[PDB]
Every structure is written in C-alpha cells, then in structure tokens.
Write a protein that binds this ligand. Sequence first.
Ligand SMILES: Cc1cc2nc3c(=O)[nH]c(=O)nc-3n(C[C@H](O)[C@H](O)[C@H](O)COP(=O)(O)O)c2cc1C
Length: 138
Amino acid sequence: MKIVYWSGTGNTEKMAELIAKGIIESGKDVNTINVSDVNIDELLNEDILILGCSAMTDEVLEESEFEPFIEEISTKISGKKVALFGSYGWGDGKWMRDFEERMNGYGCVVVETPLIVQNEPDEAEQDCIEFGKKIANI
Ligand SMILES: Cc1cc2nc3c(=O)[nH]c(=O)nc-3n(C[C@H](O)[C@H](O)[C@H](O)COP(=O)(O)O)c2cc1C
C-alpha cells in the first residue's frame, strides 16, 4: 500500500507514520511517500490511495505541491478507493470537508471518515494506528 502526504512542520508526517504502523501491525506492507517524491504512474496501480495534507492558507490544501498533485491525478482516479487524513490548527475541519467532497466529485470512493487531528498527534496516537488498521481491513 502507499501513503502520500504533505507536511509543513511534521504533524501530518507523524500521522502518516502512525497510520503506516497500523497497516504493518495488521500484517501488510506500506510505503510512506512525501508528495514531492511521488511517482504518479506507480501510485495509480494501488487499489487504495491514502492521502494526507494539513490545512493551509485559509481552509484549503497546500498550494505549491499538494494541490497540483491532486489536480494531476483527478482525471485518472474515478472508481478508486481513497482514505484521507491531515492535521489542522484552529478551524474545525472545513478544508477536509472540502477535500472529501472534491475526491467524491472525481468519482472516488472515500472508504472511511477522514481522520483529522489538531496539531501534533500526541493523545491521538492510537487513533492514527486504528485508522491504519481499518484501511488494512478493506
Ligand atoms: C500559513 C498557514 C495557514 C494555515 N491555515 C490553517 C487553516 O485555515 N485552518 C487550520 O485549522 N489550520 C491552519 N493552519 C495550521 C496547520 O494546519 C497546523 O499547524 C497543522 O498541525 C500543521 O501540520 P503539518 O506540520 O503537517 O503542516 C495553517 C498553518 C499555516 C502555516
């Protein structure tokens, strides 16, 4: 499996590692890839795309790297399963509500409720691991 993410200070990156740990504990393998090093053709071979990005600017996806990546794959993911996650700071998840609506609009099947954690996942560590386990069970 593959987890692609963008993280500005490391919060979403930490979530990614924990979600990976959950998948691995379930007995499967998984690679975490920062959005800047992703190979789209390979990524499209996956049955489930696990994507993460923190809330940026004003409730939107990071603009210089993550957003273009989503635009890039938008036309080639109809019918694919996707799981979404990310950290946020002061809002209440508007950027994630929009991200989920967007992926749905592209024809994707959002397999689970998106996982959002405020700031660093300290207390939510197990929640991240459990999300990974849910994904590994699909
Ligand atoms: C320029 C900038 C804009 C942000 N905009 C939002 C926002 O609209 N809503 C929110 O809840 N957090 C916002 N945040 C806070 C981050 O989403 C939050 O600090 C998160 O934990 C960062 O995760 P990361 O280290 O994975 O990037 C913003 C942070 C920065 C740096």
